[PDB]
Design a protein around this ligand. Structure first.
Ligand SMILES: NC(=O)c1ccc[n+]([C@@H]2O[C@H](COP(=O)([O-])OP(=O)(O)OC[C@H]3O[C@@H](n4cnc5c(N)ncnc54)[C@H](OP(=O)(O)O)[C@@H]3O)[C@@H](O)[C@H]2O)c1
Length: 310
């Protein structure tokens, strides 16, 4: 029997990851930071799956709360004795909208277009201002929450669950990153060199990058910095997550540890805009959670590359 834990699973992609793994016969620990939302999610999904009660287990988990993280490791040890699959799905954007919320989608569309141009060799990210009457507000508190959730969360939960994952015959970690973690989007030349220098990459180096970013947004104005012009904490945190994916994969070679982008999908975080359904999005992390032994590890896969892997 295989056991999978999914973070941020009361809604969105994480809820659908739980569905798709459970349909494979994997026993899923659906976790969520709010107990009521998670219990209700478990009830709804058990109904929709139409399977017996033991196929889906709820446990509270806030990935920014070190006691919460420790407690779920104790629970898994006592109830199951091992873990086979960890999906680090929980995430936040670091952005507060003012005015017309579809401005969030305007910036997403602009940044995918910019990434395509940079991936094709363009040297510069085009400047962007939105059309509709709204703006993305990026403050220190949001950025800190974004970094602590998106980067420290997966790192700390990975570290807490290593002893249980080591008892699996095929240990799997999937980190739900985003395409906006590309170093092409990160702007900061020091940080791009650090996160890109794989032979010198350590957890200490990545922690240092994100802490310099947070100090910069706290203490001054990012427009004067060499950090990104917008989605700054999203970019930094997801780049840091991708780097930690590589660090962990090298440290735990018997595991397969990968980062993915699910594609642009309709969830609360995107105001339910984007071309993909939430079921379509979850296909990507599920694909890497079921990767056969010997497959790639330590990598970042965007959607189409992920789905083509086998
Ligand atoms: N949708 C897209 O287009 C897209 C594209 C690329 C990457 N992603 C990534 O996909 C992941 C899932 O987001 P989504 O699109 O499914 O959005 P979503 O519907 O907003 O779901 C986010 C989930 O994360 C949970 N969460 C947030 N902070 C948490 C914390 N401290 N501890 C535990 N759970 C926490 C949320 O819980 P609450 O209900 O309590 O807030 C919710 O369950 C994120 O990591 C995001 O960066 C999404």
């Amino acid at each position: 029997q295989r056991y999978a834990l999914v973070t941020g699973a009361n809604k969105g992609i994480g809820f659908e990851i739980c569905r798709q793994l459970a349909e494979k016969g994997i026993i899923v620990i659906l976790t969520s930071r709010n107990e009521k939302r998670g219990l209700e999610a478990r009830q709804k999904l058990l109904k929709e799956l139409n399977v017996s009660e033991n196929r889906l287990v709820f446990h509270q988990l806030d990935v920014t709360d070190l006691a919460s993280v420790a407690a779920v490791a104790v629970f898994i040890k006592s109830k199951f004795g091992k873990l086979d699959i960890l999906v680090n799905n929980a995430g936040v954007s670091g952005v507060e909208m003012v005015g017309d919320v579809s401005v969030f989608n305007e910036y997403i569309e602009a940044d995918f277009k910019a990434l395509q141009a940079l991936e094709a060799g363009a040297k510069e990210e085009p400047p962007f201002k939105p059309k509709a009457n709204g703006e993305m507000i990026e403050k220190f508190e949001g950025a800190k929450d974004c970094v602590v959730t998106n980067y420290y969360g997966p790192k700390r939960l990975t570290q807490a669950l290593i002893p249980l994952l080591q008892l699996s015959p095929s240990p799997r970690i999937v980190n739900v990153s985003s395409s906006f973690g590309s170093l092409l989007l990160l702007w900061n030349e020091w940080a791009k060199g650090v996160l890109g220098d794989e032979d010198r990459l350590t957890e200490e180096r990545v922690d240092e990058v994100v802490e310099v970013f947070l100090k910069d947004i706290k203490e001054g104005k990012l427009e004067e910095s060499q950090w990104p012009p917008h989605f700054a904490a999203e970019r930094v945190s997801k780049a840091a997550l991708n780097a930690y994916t590589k660090i962990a994969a090298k440290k735990y070679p018997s595991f397969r540890i990968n980062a993915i982008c699910p594609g642009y999908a309709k969830t609360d975080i995107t105001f339910h805009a984007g071309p993909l359904s939430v079921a379509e999005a979850a296909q990507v992390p599920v694909k890497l959670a079921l990767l056969p032994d010997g497959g790639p590890s330590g990598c970042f896969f965007p959607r189409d590359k992920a789905l083509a892997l086998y």
